CSV table of C-alpha atoms in Angstrom, one decimal:
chain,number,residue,atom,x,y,z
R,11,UNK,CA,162.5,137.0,103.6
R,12,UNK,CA,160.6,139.8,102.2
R,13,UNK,CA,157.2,141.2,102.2
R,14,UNK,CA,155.0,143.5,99.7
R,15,UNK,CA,152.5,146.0,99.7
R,16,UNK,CA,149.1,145.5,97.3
R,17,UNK,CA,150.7,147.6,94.9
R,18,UNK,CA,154.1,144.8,94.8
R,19,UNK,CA,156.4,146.9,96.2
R,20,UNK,CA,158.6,145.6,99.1
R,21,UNK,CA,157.9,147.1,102.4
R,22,UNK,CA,159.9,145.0,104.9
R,23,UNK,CA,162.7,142.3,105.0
R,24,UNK,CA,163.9,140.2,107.4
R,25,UNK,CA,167.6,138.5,107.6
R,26,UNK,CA,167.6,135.6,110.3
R,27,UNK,CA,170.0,133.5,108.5
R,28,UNK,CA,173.4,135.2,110.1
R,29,UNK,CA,174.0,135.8,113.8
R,30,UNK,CA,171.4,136.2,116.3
R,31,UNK,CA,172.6,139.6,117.7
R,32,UNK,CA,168.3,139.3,119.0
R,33,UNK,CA,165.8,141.9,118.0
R,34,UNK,CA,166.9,144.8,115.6
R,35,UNK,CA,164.9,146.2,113.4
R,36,UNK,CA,165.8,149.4,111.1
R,37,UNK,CA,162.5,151.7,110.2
R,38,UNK,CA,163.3,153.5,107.4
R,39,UNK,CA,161.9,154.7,103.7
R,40,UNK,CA,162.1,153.7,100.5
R,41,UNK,CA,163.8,157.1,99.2
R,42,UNK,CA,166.2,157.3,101.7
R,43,UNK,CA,170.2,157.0,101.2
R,44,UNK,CA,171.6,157.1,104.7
R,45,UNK,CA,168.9,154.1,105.7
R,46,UNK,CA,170.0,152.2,102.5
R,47,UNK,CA,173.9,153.0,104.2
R,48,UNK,CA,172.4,151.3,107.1
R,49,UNK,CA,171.1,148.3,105.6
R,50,UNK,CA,174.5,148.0,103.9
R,51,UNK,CA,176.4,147.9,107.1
R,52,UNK,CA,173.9,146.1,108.7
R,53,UNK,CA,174.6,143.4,106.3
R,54,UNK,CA,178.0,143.8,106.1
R,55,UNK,CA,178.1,142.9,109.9
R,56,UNK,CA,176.4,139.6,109.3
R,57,UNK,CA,173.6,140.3,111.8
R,58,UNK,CA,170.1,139.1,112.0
R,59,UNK,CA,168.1,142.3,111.3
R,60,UNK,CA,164.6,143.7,110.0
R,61,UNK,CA,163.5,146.3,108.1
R,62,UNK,CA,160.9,148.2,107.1
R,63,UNK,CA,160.3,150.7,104.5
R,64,UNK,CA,157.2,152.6,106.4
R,65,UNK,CA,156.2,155.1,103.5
R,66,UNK,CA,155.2,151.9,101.5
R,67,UNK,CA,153.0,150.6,104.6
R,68,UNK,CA,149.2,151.7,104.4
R,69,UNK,CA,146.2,151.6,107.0
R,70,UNK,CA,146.8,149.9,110.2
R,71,UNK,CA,150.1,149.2,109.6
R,72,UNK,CA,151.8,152.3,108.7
R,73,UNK,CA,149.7,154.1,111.9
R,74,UNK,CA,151.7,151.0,113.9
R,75,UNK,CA,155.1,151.3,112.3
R,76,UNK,CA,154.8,155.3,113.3
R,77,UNK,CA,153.5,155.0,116.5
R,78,UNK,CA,156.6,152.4,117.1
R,79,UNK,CA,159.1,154.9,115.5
R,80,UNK,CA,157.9,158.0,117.5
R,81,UNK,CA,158.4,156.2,121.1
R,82,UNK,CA,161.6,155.1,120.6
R,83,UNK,CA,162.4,158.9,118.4
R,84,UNK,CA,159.8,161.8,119.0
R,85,UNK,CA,161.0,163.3,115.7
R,86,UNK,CA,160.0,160.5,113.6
R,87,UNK,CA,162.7,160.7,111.8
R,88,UNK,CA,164.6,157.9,109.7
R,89,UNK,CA,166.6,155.6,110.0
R,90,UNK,CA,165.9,154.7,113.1
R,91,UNK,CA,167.5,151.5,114.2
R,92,UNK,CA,165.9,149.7,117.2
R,93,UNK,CA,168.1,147.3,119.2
R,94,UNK,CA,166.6,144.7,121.8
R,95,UNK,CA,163.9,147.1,122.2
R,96,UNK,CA,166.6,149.1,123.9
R,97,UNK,CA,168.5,151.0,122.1
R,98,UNK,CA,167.6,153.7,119.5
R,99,UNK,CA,169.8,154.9,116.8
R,100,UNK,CA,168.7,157.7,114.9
R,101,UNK,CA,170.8,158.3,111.4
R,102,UNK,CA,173.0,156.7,110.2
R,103,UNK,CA,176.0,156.5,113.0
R,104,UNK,CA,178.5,153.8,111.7
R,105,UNK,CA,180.6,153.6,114.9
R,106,UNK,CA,177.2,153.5,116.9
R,107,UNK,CA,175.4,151.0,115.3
R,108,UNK,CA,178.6,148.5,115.5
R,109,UNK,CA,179.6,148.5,118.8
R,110,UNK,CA,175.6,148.6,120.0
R,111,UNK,CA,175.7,145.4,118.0
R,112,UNK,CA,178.8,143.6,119.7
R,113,UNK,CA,181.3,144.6,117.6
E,7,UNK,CA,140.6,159.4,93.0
E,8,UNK,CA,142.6,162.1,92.2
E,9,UNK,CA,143.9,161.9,96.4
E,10,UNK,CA,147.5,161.2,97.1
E,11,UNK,CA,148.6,159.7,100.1
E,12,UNK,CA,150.9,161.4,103.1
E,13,UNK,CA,154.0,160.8,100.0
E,14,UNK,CA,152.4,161.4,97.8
E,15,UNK,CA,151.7,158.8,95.9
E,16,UNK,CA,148.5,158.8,93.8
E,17,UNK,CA,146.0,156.2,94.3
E,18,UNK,CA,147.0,153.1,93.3
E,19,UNK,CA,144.0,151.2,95.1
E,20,UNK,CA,143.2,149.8,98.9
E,21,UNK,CA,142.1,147.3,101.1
E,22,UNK,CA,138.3,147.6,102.1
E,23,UNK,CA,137.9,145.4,105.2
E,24,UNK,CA,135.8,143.2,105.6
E,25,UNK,CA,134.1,139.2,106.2
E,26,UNK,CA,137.2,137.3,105.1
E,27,UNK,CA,136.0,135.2,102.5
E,28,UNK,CA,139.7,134.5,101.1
E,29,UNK,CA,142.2,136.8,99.7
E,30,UNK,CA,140.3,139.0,97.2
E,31,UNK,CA,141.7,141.3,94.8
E,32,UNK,CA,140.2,143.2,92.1
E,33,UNK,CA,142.2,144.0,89.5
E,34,UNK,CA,140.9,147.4,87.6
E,35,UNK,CA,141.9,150.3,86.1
E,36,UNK,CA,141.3,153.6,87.3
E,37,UNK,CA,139.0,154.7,85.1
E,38,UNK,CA,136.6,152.1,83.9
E,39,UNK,CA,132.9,151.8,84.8
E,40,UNK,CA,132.6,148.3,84.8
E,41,UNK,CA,135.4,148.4,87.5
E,42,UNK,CA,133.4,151.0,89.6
E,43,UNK,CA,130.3,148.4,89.1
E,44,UNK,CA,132.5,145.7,90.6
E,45,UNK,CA,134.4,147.7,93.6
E,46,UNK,CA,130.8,149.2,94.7
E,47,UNK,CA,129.3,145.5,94.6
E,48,UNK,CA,132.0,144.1,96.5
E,49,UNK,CA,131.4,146.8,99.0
E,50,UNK,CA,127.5,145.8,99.0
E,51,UNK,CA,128.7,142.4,99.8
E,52,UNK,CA,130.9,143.2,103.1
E,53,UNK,CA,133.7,141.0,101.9
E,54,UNK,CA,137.3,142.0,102.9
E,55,UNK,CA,138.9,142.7,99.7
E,56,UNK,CA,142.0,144.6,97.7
E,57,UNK,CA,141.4,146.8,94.6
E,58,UNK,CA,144.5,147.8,92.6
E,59,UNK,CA,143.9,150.3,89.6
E,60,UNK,CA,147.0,148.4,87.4
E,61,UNK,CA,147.2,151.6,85.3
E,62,UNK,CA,148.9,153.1,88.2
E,63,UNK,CA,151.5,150.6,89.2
E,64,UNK,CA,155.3,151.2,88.4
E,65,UNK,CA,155.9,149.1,85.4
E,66,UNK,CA,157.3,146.1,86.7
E,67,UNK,CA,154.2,145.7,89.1
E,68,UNK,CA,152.4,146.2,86.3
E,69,UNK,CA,153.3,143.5,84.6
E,70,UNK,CA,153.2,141.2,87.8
E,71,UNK,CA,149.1,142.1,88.2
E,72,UNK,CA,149.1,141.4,84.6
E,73,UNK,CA,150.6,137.9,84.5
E,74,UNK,CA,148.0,137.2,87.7
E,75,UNK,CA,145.4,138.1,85.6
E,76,UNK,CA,146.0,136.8,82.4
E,77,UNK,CA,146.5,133.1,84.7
E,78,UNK,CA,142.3,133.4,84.4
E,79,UNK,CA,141.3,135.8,81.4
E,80,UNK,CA,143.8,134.6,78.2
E,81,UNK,CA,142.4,138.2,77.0
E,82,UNK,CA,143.6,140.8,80.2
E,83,UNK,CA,140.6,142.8,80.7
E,84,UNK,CA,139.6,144.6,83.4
E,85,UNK,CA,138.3,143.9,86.4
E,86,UNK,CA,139.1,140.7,87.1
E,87,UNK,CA,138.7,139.2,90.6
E,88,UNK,CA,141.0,136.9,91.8
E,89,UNK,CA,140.5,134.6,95.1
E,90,UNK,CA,143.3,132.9,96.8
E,91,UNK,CA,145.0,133.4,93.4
E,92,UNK,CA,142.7,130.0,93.0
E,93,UNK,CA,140.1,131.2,90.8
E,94,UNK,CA,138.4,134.6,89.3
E,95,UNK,CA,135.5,136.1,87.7
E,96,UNK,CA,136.3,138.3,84.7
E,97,UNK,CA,133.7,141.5,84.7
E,98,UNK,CA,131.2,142.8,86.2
E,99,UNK,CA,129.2,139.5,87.0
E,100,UNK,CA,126.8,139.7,90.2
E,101,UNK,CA,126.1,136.0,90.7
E,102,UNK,CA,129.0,135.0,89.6
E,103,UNK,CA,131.1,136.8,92.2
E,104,UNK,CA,128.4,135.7,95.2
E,105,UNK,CA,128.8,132.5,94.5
E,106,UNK,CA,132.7,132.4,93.5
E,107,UNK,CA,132.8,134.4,97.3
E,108,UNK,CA,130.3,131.2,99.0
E,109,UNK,CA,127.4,133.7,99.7
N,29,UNK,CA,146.3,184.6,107.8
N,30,UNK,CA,148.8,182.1,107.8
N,31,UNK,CA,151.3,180.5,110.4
N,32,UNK,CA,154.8,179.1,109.2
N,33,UNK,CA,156.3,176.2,111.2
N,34,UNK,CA,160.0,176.8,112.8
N,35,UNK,CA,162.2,176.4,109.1
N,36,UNK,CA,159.7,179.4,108.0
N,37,UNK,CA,157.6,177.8,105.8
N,38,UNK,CA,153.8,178.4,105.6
N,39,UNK,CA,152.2,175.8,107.3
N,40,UNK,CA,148.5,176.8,107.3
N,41,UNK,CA,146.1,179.7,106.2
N,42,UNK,CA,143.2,180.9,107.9
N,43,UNK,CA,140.9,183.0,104.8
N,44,UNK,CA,137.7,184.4,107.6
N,45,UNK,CA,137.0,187.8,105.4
N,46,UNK,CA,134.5,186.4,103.2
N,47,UNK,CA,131.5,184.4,103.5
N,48,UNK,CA,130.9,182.4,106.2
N,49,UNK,CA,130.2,179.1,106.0
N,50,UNK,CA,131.3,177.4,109.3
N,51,UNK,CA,134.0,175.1,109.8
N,52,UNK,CA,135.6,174.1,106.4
N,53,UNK,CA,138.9,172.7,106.5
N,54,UNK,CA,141.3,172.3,103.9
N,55,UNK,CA,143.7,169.1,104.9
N,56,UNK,CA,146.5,169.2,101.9
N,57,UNK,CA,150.3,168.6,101.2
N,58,UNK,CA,152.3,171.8,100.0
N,59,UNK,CA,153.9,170.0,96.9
N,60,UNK,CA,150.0,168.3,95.9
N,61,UNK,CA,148.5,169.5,92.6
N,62,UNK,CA,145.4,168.7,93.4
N,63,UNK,CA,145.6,169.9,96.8
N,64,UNK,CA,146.7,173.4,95.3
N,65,UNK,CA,143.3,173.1,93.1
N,66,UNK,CA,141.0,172.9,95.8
N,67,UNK,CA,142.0,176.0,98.1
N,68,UNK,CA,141.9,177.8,94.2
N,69,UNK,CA,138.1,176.7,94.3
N,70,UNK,CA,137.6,177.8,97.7
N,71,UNK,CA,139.4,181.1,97.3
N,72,UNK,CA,137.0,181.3,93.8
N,73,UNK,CA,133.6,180.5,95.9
N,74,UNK,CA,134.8,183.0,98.2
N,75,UNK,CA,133.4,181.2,100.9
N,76,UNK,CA,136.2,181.0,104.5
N,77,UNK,CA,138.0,178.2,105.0
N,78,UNK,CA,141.2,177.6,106.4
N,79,UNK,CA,144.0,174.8,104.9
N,80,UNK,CA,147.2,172.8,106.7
N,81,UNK,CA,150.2,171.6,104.5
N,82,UNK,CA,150.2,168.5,107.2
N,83,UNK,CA,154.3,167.4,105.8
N,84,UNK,CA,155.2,170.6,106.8
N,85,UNK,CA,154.3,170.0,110.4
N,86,UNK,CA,156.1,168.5,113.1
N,87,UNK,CA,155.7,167.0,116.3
N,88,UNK,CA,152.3,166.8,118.0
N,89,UNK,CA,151.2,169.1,115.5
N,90,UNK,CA,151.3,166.9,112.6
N,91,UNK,CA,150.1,163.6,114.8
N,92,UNK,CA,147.5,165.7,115.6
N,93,UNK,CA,146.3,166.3,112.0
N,94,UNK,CA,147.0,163.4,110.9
N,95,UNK,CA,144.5,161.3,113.2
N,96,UNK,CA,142.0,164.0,112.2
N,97,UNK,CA,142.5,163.1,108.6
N,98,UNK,CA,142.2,159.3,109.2
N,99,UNK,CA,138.7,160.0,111.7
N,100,UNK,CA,137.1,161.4,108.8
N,101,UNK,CA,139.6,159.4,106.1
N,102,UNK,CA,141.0,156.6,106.8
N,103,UNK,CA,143.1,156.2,103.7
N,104,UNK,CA,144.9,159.3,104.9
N,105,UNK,CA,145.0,160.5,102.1
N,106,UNK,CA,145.5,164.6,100.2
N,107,UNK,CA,143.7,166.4,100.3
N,108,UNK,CA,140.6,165.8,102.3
N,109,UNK,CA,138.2,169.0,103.2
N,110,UNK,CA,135.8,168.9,106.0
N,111,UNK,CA,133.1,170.5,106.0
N,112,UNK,CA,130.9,171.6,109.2
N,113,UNK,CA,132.6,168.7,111.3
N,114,UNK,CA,130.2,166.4,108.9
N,115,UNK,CA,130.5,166.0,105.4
N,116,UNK,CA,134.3,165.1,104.2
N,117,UNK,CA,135.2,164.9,100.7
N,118,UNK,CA,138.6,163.2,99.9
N,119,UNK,CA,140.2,164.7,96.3
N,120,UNK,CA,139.5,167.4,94.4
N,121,UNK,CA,135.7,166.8,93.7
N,122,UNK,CA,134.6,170.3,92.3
N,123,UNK,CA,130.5,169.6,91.9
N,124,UNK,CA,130.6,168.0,95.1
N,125,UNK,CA,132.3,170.8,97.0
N,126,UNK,CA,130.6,173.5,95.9
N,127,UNK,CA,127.2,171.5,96.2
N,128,UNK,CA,128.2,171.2,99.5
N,129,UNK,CA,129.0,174.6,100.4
N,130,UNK,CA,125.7,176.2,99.3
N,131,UNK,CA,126.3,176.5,95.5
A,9,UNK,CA,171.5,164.3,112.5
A,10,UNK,CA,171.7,162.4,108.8
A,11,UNK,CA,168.3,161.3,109.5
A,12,UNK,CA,164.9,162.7,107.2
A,13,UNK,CA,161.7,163.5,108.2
A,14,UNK,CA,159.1,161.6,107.4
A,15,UNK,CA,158.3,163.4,103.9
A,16,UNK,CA,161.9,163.0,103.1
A,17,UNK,CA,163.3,166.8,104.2
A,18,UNK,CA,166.7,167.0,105.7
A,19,UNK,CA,167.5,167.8,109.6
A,20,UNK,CA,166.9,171.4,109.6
A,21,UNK,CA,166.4,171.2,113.4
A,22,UNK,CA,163.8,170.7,116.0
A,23,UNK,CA,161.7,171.9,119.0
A,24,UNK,CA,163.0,170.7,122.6
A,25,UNK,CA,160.1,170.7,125.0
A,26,UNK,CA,160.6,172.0,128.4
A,27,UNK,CA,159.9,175.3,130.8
A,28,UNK,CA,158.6,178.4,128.9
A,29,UNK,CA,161.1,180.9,129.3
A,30,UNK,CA,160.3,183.3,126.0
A,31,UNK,CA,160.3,182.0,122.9
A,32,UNK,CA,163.8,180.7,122.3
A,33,UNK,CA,165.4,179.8,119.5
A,34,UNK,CA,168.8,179.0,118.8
A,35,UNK,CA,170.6,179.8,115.1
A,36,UNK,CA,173.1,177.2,114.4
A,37,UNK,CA,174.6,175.2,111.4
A,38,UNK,CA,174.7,171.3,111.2
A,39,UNK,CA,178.0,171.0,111.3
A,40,UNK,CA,179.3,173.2,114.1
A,41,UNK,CA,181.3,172.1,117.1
A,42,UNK,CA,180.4,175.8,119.6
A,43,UNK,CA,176.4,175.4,118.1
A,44,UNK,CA,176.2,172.0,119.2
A,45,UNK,CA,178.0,173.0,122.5
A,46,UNK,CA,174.8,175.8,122.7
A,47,UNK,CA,172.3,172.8,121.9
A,48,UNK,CA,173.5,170.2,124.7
A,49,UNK,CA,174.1,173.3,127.1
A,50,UNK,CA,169.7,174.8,126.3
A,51,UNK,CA,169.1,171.0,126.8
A,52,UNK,CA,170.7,170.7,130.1
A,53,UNK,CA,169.3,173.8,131.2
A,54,UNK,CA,165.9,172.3,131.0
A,55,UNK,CA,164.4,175.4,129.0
A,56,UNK,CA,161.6,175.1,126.0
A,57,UNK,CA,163.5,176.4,123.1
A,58,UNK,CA,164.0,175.6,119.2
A,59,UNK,CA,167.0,174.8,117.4
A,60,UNK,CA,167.2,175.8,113.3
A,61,UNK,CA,170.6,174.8,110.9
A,62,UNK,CA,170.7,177.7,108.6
A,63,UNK,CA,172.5,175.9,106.5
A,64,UNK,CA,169.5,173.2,105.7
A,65,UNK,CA,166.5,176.0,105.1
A,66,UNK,CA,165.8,176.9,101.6
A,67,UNK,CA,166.8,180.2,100.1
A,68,UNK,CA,164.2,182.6,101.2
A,69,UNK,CA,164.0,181.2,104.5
A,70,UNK,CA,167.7,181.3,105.0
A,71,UNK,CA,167.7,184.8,104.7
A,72,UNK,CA,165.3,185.3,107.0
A,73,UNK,CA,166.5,183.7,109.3
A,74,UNK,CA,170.0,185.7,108.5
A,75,UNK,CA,168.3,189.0,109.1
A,76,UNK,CA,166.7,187.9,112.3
A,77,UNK,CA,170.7,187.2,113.2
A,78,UNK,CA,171.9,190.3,111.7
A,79,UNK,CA,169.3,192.3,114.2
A,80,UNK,CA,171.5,190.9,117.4
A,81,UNK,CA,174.6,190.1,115.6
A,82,UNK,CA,176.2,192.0,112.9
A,83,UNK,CA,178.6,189.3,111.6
A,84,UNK,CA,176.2,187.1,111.3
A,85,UNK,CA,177.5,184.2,113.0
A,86,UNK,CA,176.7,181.1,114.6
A,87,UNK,CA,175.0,180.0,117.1
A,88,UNK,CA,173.1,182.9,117.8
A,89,UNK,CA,170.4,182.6,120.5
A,90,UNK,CA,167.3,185.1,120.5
A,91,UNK,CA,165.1,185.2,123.1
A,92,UNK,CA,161.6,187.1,121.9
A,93,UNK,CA,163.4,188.4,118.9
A,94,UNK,CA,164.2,191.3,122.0
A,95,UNK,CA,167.5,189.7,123.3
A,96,UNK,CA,170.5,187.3,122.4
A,97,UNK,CA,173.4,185.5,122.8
A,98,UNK,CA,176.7,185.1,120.7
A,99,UNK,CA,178.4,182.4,120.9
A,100,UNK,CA,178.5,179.6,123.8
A,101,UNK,CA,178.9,182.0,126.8
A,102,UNK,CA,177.4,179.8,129.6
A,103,UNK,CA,177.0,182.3,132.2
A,104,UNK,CA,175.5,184.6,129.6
A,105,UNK,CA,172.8,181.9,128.3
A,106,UNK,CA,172.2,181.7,132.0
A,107,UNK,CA,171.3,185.4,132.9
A,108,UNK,CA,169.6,186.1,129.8
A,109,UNK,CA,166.8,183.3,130.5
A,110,UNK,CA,166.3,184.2,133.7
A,111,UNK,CA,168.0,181.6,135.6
């Protein structure tokens, strides 16, 4: 599934149609190659996975998805990959992201 | 206003919260008085609402406001306020946007 | 004067050699147009003022000035000048700024 | 890291928060096998310090960031770690990092 901003521009996805590897959930940006190389790999594993795009977020929301980015990464940097509110992955780290995931 | 947001991103609209009277959106155009008229009246009123200036949508959001609006207003003027993409009041019409909102 | 942040770019200016007129504040982006037009009026009214170019801070820095900029703006948007800890005016509004200034 | 800032920017290093021993900052490029050896060693020592890839500043920056090298280091190599812009270290030399803060 996806969601939009007002201004019809997809902020966030969600994939729960493959294998329930639980919670994960990529915060990245809209302008960003190495979070679109996650997304790609994330996909490519087959795993259930969000995603949000936090420079298209406004008010409430982008304050939230920052506040949720910064505790898990202080530099608020992106992507950062979140998995079962565990474990944070900051860039795009192939080997990483894959085993963290079961594989 | 000439503001851009923390990407910079000019001002493509907002949400003005509010009594939730349904999901209202104003669709305007940056500059246009009538459209001022309209965003300052729904501000009177307290209603939770969304402006979005079309003029400064990428082009294929653009044409998706467009299509919503010309659903109620054949001729695609501006502003047109849509609730619960269920019905609309084309311009700057007091009593017909209280009573359209159930005031 | 003017501090840069650790990759040696100027992050904010301090101009306190001309006319005081309290606390004004300059919140802007370094790559903002409009931004960039409104420390040119200050620096023309001659009056002091200090400006922060808030994407090139980091850490609790740039958390910090951003919830400033959502207290007084809570689009969070570029630039926003504050004047005397009361009066904010988001955009480059030139009447209204130097109105508000003593002009 | 791969990973952008929020406004988009590149890894061009960070601040490390812990004891004030001088104003520390290490000199390093992003890809660098003895530099990161320097990072993970200033992190398990505990000490406040910066970290900056040369490599990722733009132009003017670079080069001051060279000079500042230059002062301690006449090849110009990396990591170099200053301490006050009054001391430094070439190279990862443990026992040197060591003395030089005050260990």
């Amino acid at each position: 599934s996806n969601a939009v901003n007002l201004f019809g521009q997809k902020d966030r996805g969600n994939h729960v149609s493959g294998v329930d590897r639980g919670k994960v959930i990529m915060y990245g940006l809209s302008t960003c190659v190495w979070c679109k190389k996650t997304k790609k790999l994330l996909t490519d594993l087959g795993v259930d996975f969000d995603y949000v795009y936090v420079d298209r977020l406004e008010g409430k929301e982008e304050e939230e998805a920052v506040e949720e980015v910064r505790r898990f990464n202080p530099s608020v940097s992106f992507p950062t990959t979140i998995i079962n509110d565990e474990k944070a992955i900051v860039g795009f780290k192939e080997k990483e992201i894959r085993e963290s995931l079961g594989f």
